[PDB]
């Protein structure tokens, strides 16, 4: 990271390392919560992106790799390319940041893709956990807005956020893109907007997203389209907290795995018949975190799975030193995906997952720090969200 501030106030962050693939992009604090419903932000930014790139043929002919991530509170666009495609890439990023609304026909095309997301392989288990967590563990109900519309619901262009993007953009890039990004950043209006955005407080709501799944998802006949998902959430910590690396270690202790070795794997995946998988994540938001445990299983079996999750929680308190080191070991995964993590970590203000500084943080987490993290997190009642018909209050009883 080389961090600059342009004369007009625009922040510019650059990823150090060897030449080969050029990277550019924009990260800004506008996300699904900044539109009145699910998918409004996603489809608005997608519509804008496809217009900005001119046509899919231009994208292919220049061999540019675009990537758009829309989260609850923020989004980013990255473009990767070889040096001969610089002009087109920069001109495309410039168009994306120009404030103009896309055409209705573009928006209509994008809407249809969005409704087809699950069928197209774009609405996988990971994206489902995120929706279940966000619809259940916040007091602000705007966090229920995801990226992927329900079949019966509307999606509308939000032209105001397109005007807002250049006013709150941070530019990101590989170090060799310095000159071009200074110049692009220079073209933007001085000076950026400064908004106090704060992650909504934790609330242990009990909800269902009782909705049918498509049989074909992407190219696969889904092995999970007939199973339910249980997501249990507790508050944790912001990505900037001194405690975040303890939380990463705590998520590996629970760990998980698929039927296709740690507490979730051995006790939950092993303990419920036809439990396809179970995983713990610690997910970050602008100022907070949600520690979440997700179980894929038949609807009838979720209560049992939850009892087994309660057992996992109790078990952590007496975890052996072997396992506390193995958990520290599992967080250390060094390995394109590098630039996306650079951008993500630049917004959160945390050290990237691949950095040695991050790896050192993890080596330094104690038994005390893990015990502290566990205590403050599991003192809350969980939020409870079911993808499927199971009664969440029955699951909730397991923890009260």
């Amino acid at each position: 990271c080389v961090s600059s501030v342009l004369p007009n106030g625009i922040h510019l962050k650059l990823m150090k390392g060897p030449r080969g693939v050029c990277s550019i992009g924009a990260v800004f604090p506008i996300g699904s919560i900044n539109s009145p419903k699910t998918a409004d932000t996603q489809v608005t930014l997608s519509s804008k992106l496809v217009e900005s790139l001119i046509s899919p043929k231009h994208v292919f002919m220049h061999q540019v790799y675009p990537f758009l991530q829309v989260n609850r509170e923020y989004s980013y666009l990255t473009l990767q390319f070889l040096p001969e495609s610089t002009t087109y890439a920069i001109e495309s990023l410039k168009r994306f940041l120009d404030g103009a609304a896309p055409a209705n026909t573009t928006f209509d095309q994008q809407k249809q893709l969005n409704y087809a997301a699950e069928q197209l392989g774009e609405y996988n288990l990971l994206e489902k956990y995120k929706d279940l967590v966000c619809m259940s563990s916040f007091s602000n109900k705007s966090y229920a807005h995801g990226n992927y519309a329900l079949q019966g619901e509307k999606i509308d262009l939000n032209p105001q956020i397109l005007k807002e993007i250049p006013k709150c953009t941070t530019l990101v890039g590989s170090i060799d893109m310095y000159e071009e990004l200074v110049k692009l950043g220079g073209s933007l209006s001085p000076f950026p907007k400064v908004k106090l955005h704060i992650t909504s407080n934790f609330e242990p709501n009990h909800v269902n997203k009782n909705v049918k799944q498509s049989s074909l998802q992407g190219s696969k006949i889904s092995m999970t389209s007939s199973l339910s998902i249980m997501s249990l959430s507790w508050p944790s910590c912001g990505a900037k907290s001194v405690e975040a690396p303890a939380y990463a270690v705590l998520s590996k202790i629970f760990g998980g795995g698929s039927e296709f070795s740690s507490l979730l794997y051995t006790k939950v995946v092993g303990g419920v018949a036809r439990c396809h998988q179970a995983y713990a994540y610690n997910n970050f938001f602008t100022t907070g975190g949600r520690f979440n445990i997700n179980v894929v299983a038949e609807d009838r079996n979720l209560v049992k799975a939850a009892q087994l999750v309660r057992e996992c929680i109790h078990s952590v308190e007496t975890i052996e030193d072997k396992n506390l080191d193995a958990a520290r070991g599992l967080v250390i995964t060094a390995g394109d995906k590098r630039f996306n993590e650079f951008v993500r970590s630049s917004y959160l203000g945390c050290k990237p997952i691949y950095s040695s500084q991050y790896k050192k943080s993890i080596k330094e987490v104690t038994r005390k720090a893990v015990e502290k993290a566990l205590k403050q997190t599991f003192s809350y009642k969980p939020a409870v969200a079911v993808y499927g018909p199971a009664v969440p209050n029955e699951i909730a009883k397991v923890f009260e």
């Binding site: 060897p18 030449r19 080969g20 693939v21 992106l49 496809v50 790139l53 046509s55 899919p56 043929k57 994208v59 292919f60 002919m61 061999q63 540019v64 790799y65 675009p66 070889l82 001969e84 197209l120 498509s214 049989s215 074909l216 190219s219 696969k220 006949i221 092995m223 296709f260 070795s261 072997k322 080191d325 193995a326 070991g329 250390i332 060094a334 390995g335 394109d336 590098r338």
Partner: protein
């Protein structure tokens, strides 16, 4: 990244050839690349190469399964293996302070297995489940069906073996594949690394001290001329009503051998059609609304397969077929051929650039290159060959492989 390099290769007195290529950074990928794969099988042993690969990784005397599990968990020796139609590898990606343990584990597992009826019989369910799982990805199923109807020879086999084949695999069959395919003269140890060549060499020396030199060299059971492939275009249609209002389709043509002067032309043509991504579609495709598109072209001994596949709604299936055939034809038009060459060359270069940032990718290309080519091909020579490729080379590729040729085709339909 890697600096237009060239591998350094030494042979130990026990026969093991150690090939390293210099890389910057703290990651090292290393391990064994072996010319073992389903191309070298027949009807009696179909699936054995992959079945062996699993058995190897179930541990041996010195490093039983529990010891292996313990090494991943506490010592960061994360072992990876895969089997293709043409090669097999067992590797680890490591920090450099883990070298001697990693060379020792890999050498022990690959070269000193202990293949027992109990471990073989116990593994069967894992392979059966893997075969089941891959069967639910219809891109994999249609890829295999396309190979199956195009080749009566061994390329037509699935890598995993059929369900029935997985069930019939014996310990003797597994031991036979190891005895005939895993000798020093059929493999390379590969390291992609900052460590000096000599450090890797000494470490492998120490790891393979148990290994005795070969007395003789029977013709390798992996020699391409023992497994001559015959492409024959066929059409077959399947049902899968669980798909609903969806169908998968795959179109195939024979492709050049790896050493053919027409290999790079075939790669360029395949790439200019390329894949459909969220934001990206070939300028050769007229209906950019096609749901999806994936293109691949692989060499297989004296033969090879170029494949185009996708899925669509029932009503759009026939239109997908026409779009793809039209796109392929469009390249050959004198108004389009120059531009098709340029874009396709850029596609191949972009694919290369993206491969140069990972030690895993670099290791796999280096291991495959060493096993499969007459002589090593540097990225250096490769780029010159790409840059020297011209319109007449593309035309000659079209003349031999595409024009007036019957294609294979498979359809798997939710309705048909």
């Amino acid at each position: 990244i890697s600096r237009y390099a060239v591998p350094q290769i030494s042979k130990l007195s026990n026969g093991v050839r150690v090939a390293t290529i210099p890389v910057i950074g703290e990651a090292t990928t290393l391990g064994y690349w072996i010319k073992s794969g389903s191309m070298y099988e027949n009807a009696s042993n179909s699936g054995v190469s992959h079945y062996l690969q699993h058995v190897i990784f179930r541990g041996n005397e010195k490093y039983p399964q529990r010891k292996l599990e313990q090494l991943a968990e506490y010592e960061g020796i994360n072992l990876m293996a895969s089997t293709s139609r043409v090669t097999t590898n067992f590797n680890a990606t490591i920090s450099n302070d883990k070298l001697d343990v990693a060379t020792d584990v890999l050498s022990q597992l690959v070269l000193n297995p202990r293949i027992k009826k109990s471990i073989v019989d116990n593994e069967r369910d894992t392979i059966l489940a893997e075969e089941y799982e891959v069967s639910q990805d219809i891109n994999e199923v249609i890829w295999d069906k396309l190979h199956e109807i195009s080749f009566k020879t061994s390329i037509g086999f699935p890598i995993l073996g059929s369900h029935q084949s997985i069930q019939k695999i014996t310990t003797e069959m597994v031991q036979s594949q190891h005895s005939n395919f895993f000798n020093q003269d059929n493999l390379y140890f590969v390291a992609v690394t900052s460590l000096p060549h000599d450090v890797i060499l000494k470490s492998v020396e120490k790891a393979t001290q148990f290994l005795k030199p070969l007395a003789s060299h029977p013709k390798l059971a992996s020699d391409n001329d023992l497994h001559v492939q015959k492409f024959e275009p066929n059409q077959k249609q399947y049902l899968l009503p669980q798909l609903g209002d969806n169908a998968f389709v795959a179109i195939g043509f024979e492709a050049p051998s790896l050493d053919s002067p027409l290999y790079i032309p075939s790669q360029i043509v395949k790439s200019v059609i390329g894949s459909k991504e969220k934001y990206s579609v070939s300028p050769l495709i007229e209906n950019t609304n096609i749901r999806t598109l994936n293109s691949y072209s692989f060499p297989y001994g004296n033969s090879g397969l170029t494949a185009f596949f996708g899925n669509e709604s029932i009503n759009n299936l026939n239109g997908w077929v026409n779009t793809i055939f039209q796109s392929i034809g469009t390249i050959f038009s004198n108004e389009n051929i120059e531009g098709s060459l340029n874009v396709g060359r850029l596609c191949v270069k972009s694919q290369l650039a993206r491969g140069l940032s990972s030690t895993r990718t670099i290791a796999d290309e280096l291991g495959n290159n060493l096993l499969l080519r007459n002589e090593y091909m540097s990225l250096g020579k490769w780029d010159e060959l790409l840059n020297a490729t011209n319109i007449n080379n593309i035309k000659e590729y079209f003349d031999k492989y595409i024009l007036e040729k019957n294609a294979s085709m498979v359809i798997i339909s939710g309705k048909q």
